[PDB]
Amino acid sequence: PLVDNPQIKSAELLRPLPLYQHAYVWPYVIVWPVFLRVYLTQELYDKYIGAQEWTFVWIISIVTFQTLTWLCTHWSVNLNALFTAKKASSIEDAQLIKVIPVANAGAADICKLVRDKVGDNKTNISFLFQKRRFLWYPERKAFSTLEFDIDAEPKPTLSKFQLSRGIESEDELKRLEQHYGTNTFDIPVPTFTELFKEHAVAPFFVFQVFCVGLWLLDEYWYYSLFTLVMLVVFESTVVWQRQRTLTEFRSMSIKPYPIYVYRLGKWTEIQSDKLLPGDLVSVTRTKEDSGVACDMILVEGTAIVNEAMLSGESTPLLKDSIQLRPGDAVLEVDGLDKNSLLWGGTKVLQITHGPASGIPPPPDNGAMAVVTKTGFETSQGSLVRTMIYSTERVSANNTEALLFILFLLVFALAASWYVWDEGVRKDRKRSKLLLDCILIITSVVPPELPMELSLAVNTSLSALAKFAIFCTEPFRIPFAGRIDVACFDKTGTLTGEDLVVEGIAGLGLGHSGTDTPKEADGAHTRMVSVHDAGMETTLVLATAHALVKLDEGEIVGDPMEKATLNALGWVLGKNDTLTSGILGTVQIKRRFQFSSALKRQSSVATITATEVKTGRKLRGSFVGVKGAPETIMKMLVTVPEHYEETYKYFTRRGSRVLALAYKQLTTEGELGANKINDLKRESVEADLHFAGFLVLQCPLKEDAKQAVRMLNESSHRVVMITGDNPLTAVHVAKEVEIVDRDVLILDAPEHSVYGEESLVWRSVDDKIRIDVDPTKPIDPEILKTKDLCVTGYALNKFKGQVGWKSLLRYTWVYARVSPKQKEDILLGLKDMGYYTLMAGDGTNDVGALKQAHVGVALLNGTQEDLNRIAEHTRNQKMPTLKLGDASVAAPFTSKLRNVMAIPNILRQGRCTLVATIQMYKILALNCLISAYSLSVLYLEGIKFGDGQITISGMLMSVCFLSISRARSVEGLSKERPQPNIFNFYIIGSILGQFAVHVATLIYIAQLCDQIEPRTEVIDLEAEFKPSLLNSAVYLLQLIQQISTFAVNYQGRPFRESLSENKGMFYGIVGVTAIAFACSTEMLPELNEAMKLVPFNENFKTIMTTVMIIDFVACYVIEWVLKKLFSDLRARDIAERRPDQLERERVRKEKEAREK
């Protein structure tokens, strides 16, 4: 293979051809002078030198052939490589290379090779594909990505980075600059011309232009020019709207910032753009709206960072140096060196200083680090590349449309063959025969299909703006009608980012006055605010934290600690001080931390509390601990009588409860220096007391439960993908009723041996623990009894084995997944056969948002902020929202924080999915009657009047415009709409209705010929004359055109009813009433109004009978074929157990009885 990248499937070297050797110029140069000579001076009519119709046919044919030969190089890259290039012999003369990627990872392309000359008189051959560099390696004679110092076949020794210095000499700097490039992101941001060029090449636009050009034979310039002008205006405004919304939602701007680099033995100030792998950079605090420029490894110093891009959370992480490690291989994947790597894109919250290479300290007093990657090869470079180079634009050009056009073209060719044969048997003029064949060919295949689908989509696009839900690709709305799996994020989508504190309860335990309210089992539900709390609870809350105050006054730490400190009201100060209703001073000396084992935070301090209520004074040493109720129960010496039951009620009703405890070490005096250091964790937990139960409200949006419940019972499956801990993910997923059963977490053992690999089925309570290996099937029983929660660490161990497909069907919760793993799940679900939706807000789910069929990016705005922005803009004509990165990669964008915008889009999908489907069916019917009205009826003497066709045309236009516009129904239904158009039901219904219409027309024509015989000749140029046959055929055609609209219209569970459609119902009623009144002949003036012949008494009953028979037969055929072959059932992954259905029915009945 040429390219050694799994992204690239195949490659081929090419060499360009000159302009005169192309495949669409040279045959034209051969052909054109021959025809010119024949038409000009041959004087022999081999190609009809004098006939105007034949010469025009030749000119149009040759021009169309040349235009198609030119356009075929734009719709494919194989034809581009076969028409405008030749296969090169080797790399010596090759200049262009054609690259094709994996079918689900981009688009094919043909790139240009570039050769650069290094100072050592050598040649470097490279090419750029999807803004990614590829180099030609002659040692293995292939193409590779690049070779960095961090990644190599032998793992580098730590002495390479510990003793590293800056890049010396100008030659090395120039070589690195010309070999690795600059550290920047080059977004092309195309202009209007490129967008219009891309839009005007699409096959539907070419088809419409060709049809309109064919309408220039004898229809005169009136109809063709107006249609062409409106088409050009519509395409121009579509392109302008697309470019405007692309510029509004997609910016992708990164501003460089100055940094200090140790180059040539001195510290200089360099912009962040000019950085090369091997520099010695000094990192400091990262300001607002900025991040780390390049991927680097820390050498000296400690950094507190905020990795909000990879994990998705906001908990600060601690990264240590590498100075305390000997010469060893870099274990950067999972070893001790993973905590030393500093990724590019995160923010450095704090820098702590505390060298082997003898380097002077930087002037800005930062931390030394060595760059390892730069440019588009960093961690966020892959996300930026997948933002814009992952999927193709979705438009009206589908395979279903092509098959539909081919079907109608087959019928058109049959009709044209019949017309041409009957016209050549009678030896008529070839001009009128050819014009009629062209007319029926253009009439059968509808040129109005794309401009009707576009209107049906733009109506939904305009209707979606009321919920502040903007869209970028409008043709993805029908995909929302067949959604089978709907994933969800956790930290930004369902759970609210902010946190509130309800208060502290359980302080009435121990001695009770029988006055506080109690539950049925005796649980104390007394709620006391923190401002009215006791002295002991405040003292414990003022020391059991882990927050640290920066030099500029900012504070960092856990969100719950910040929330409880804000609720406390005390103020943190330097040297670990807590100052001021207690109005005391707390000085914390020693602190203890937890790492998910023995979950409790302990601290010691010196306290001076001057109570204002009781007027007492407290001073001296103090010990405060905060943790789980079970651990405090284990370490308690005087357990209250209702301690066990008073927290179960709180933790059951969606809340987080934490127990607090205190210990008075020395009442008088302080412990002093060199005394707390020798104390261990077990020593301070000898005796404990009880202070209270801090209760925190469950972080969840008020619309989360309602939206998930609406999605669950509407034949959709809701899964959840998050990068948080499995415990919190399982708790949140159980609260919103995503999973309601026993939950098993497949993950590494909690012992964390870190040396051997193992997979176990843990539980929420450590009572079930079995061993599973990734090379065997999962279980025949686990997938049936208990639900699953597969973590992201063990997802890679199951990649490629036989258990991968079993773990993509019976799992609903994924926890701790990398940004790359968030799209593997969606790709697997898409390849399995399901449609997927995903809603998220962060930067880690960019690839998942791109690879899903429809993606929503929920922002953090509110209605009041939107109103303020609108009124500020209005005042400018006479606050802001953070766009982020998720809105760039998501086709949809909801500007409101409500998660109810996720079901609403679905409510606006089905109405677009149903209507479009109906359109297809109805169009097919009108593309089959007309083919019968121009091939068999045209050859007879049946010709309608000039005034009668206007009514039919107006009725058809009104009905089509009313069908294209649609409105949404109130609530989601259990039955799904028809997915595609090429199943047995649609084709069977179309063919049955066409057969009924043909049989009725044949019977009416036969009986009308029997009643009134014809003895004259059939004239194809005679004008309109009133007769029985013309009136009968006109009435039957009007009734059939009414029946094609009043039978194939379904709107009961997915749209508005036919009675509420004012545009269509009134027209249908009026036309049907007029036709039936003229058939039954109750108004003699009406028949004379539009040139009708008086009817016999016996013919009237036959006419009414056949009209009613036609209507009833069409309705019965449609109903039977809908009842027999409807694909209205739910998918296999969305099946609901009887228990869930029974619970839903019980809840619905209770709500109905309540109201």
Ligand code: ALF
């Ligand atoms: F809320 Al996440 F990855 F868990 F964006």
Ligand SMILES: [Ca+2]
């Ligand atoms: Ca038509």
Ligand SMILES: [Mg+2]
């Ligand atoms: Mg998030």
